[PDB]
Amino acid sequence: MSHSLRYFVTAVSRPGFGEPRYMEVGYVDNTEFVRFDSDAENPRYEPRARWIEQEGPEYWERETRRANGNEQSFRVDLRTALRYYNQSAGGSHTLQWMAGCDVESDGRLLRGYWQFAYDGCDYIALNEDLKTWTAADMAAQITRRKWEQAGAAERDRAYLEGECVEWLRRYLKNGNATLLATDPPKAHVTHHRRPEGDVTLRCWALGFYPAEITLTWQLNGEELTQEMELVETRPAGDGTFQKWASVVVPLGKQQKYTCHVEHEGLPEPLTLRW
Amino acid sequence: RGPGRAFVTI
Amino acid sequence: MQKTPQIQVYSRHPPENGKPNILNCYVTQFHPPHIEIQMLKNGKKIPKVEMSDMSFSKDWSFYILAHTEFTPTETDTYACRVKHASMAEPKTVYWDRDM
Numbered sequence: 001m002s003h004s005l006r007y008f009v010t011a012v013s014r015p016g017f018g019e020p021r022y023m024e025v026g027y028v029d030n031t032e033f034v035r036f037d038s039d040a041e042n043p044r045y046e047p048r049a050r051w052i053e054q055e056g057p058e059y060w061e062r063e064t065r066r067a068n069g070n071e072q073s074f075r076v077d078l079r080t081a082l083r084y085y086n087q088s089a090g091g092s093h094t095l096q097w098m099a100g101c102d103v104e105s106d107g108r109l110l111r112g113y114w115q116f117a118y119d120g121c122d123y124i125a126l127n128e129d130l131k132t133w134t135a136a137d138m139a140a141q142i143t144r145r146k147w148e149q150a151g152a153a154e155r156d157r158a159y160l161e162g163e164c165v166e167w168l169r170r171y172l173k174n175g176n177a178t179l180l181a182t183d184p185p186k187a188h189v190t191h192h193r194r195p196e197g198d199v200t201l202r203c204w205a206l207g208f209y210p211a212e213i214t215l216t217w218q219l220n221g222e223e224l225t226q227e228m229e230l231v232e233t234r235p236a237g238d239g240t241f242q243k244w245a246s247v248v249v250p251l252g253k254q255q256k257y258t259c260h261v262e263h264e265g266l267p268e269p270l271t272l273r274w
Numbered sequence: 275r276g277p278g279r280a281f282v283t284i
Numbered sequence: 285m286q287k288t289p290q291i292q293v294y295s296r297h298p299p300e301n302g303k304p305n306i307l308n309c310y311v312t313q314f315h316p317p318h319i320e321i322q323m324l325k326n327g328k329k330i331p332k333v334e335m336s337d338m339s340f341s342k343d344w345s346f347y348i349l350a351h352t353e354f355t356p357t358e359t360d361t362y363a364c365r366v367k368h369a370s371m372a373e374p375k376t377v378y379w380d381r382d383m
Contacts, residue, residue: 007276008339012317025339026276032339034276059275066278073279080284094317096344099277114277117344120285120315143284152282159277167275190383202383234310235349237296244383 009097011074022071036067051175101164112160183209184265203259289314309350309364320367
């Protein structure tokens with residue numbers, strides 16, 4: 001499991017405020033490099049990273065039409081949504097598109113993606129086998145059918161495997177310096193000796209990349225969850241990231257709980273304590 | 275390159 | 285559904301009184317995509333509220349990050365007020381280096 005090209009899309013039906021806000025975001029690992037925010041002066045595809053900027057006019061243009069077109073197809077979807085739900089014409093909503101490909105170091109994608117979400121819940125998604133859909137709610141059921149006969153997956157599958165994998169290695173091969181740069185976390189626990197007879201150890205993990213990580217605590221070997229506390233992986237801005245997990249402990253056990261840090265940059269899973 | 279809703283709606 | 289935003293008011297660089305910096309208000313785990321983020325310095329609002337991001341996680345859960353250039357001191361109090369649908373009132377979150 002190594003690299004990916006993930007494209008994030010959001011259609012936001014803002015009733016009365018005009019046509020839904022449409023936006024596309026391009027990703028490789030945890031890096032936004034391209035964007036398309038409907039509400040813009042020059043509505044071209046934006047180079048949201050310097051490395052991609054090497055791409056010619058043929059690219060940005062060949063992409064603008066891509067986005068702009070999709071915006072229209074979404075408009076339809078949004079409109080059609082209400083119908084499928086008897087919902088008020090004056091109600092706002094969101095249609096989310098998440099399509100990408102997780103390609104392995106050698107070169108073969110480990111997984112292709114093409115999924116949907118209306119507002120927040122999963123709507124319909126192209127399964128693991130890359131050849132079949134999934135219907136969350138009854139609405140999606142219509143779609144699975146619609147898409148089955150039309151052979152919608154076939155058209156997609158060849159992208160995730162095609163231009164996705166094909167453009168992935170290129171986006172990397174021409175901007176790998178800027179990209180790749182893997183960083184390990186520099187963890188360490190803190191010990192707040194607050195009153196109430198209970199002290200809490202906080203295990204931070206900083207300066208890492210990729211963002212994707214895993215962090216935990218182990219009390220004398222015992223795994224613990226319904227007691228732990230972990231903040232979302234917040235970005236450090238400087239290409240790096242931060243994060244942490246905390247566990248309350250009775251003032252006097254301390255040596256009994258230990259934090260774990262697993263990350264690509266790390267050789268073995270980092271175990272520590274206070 | 276990004277994917278495209280191939281005008282294959284809901 | 286309608287999920288609650290998990291705010292985090294931290295700094296882009298380890299805090300040093302006098303040493304300039306960046307204050308991030310990385311907001312996450314929230315839905316719908318509408319939200320309002322204000323970076324406040326001593327109660328008042330921060331003019332150049334440089335904000336950035338606007339995307340979402342695997343579980344669809346939206347995310348965005350605000351960030352103003354600032355400088356710590358012992359006194360100057362900084363916080364980040366987030367107003368969002370999932371909540372009844374704008375939750376304000378103060379800056380706390382010591383963690």
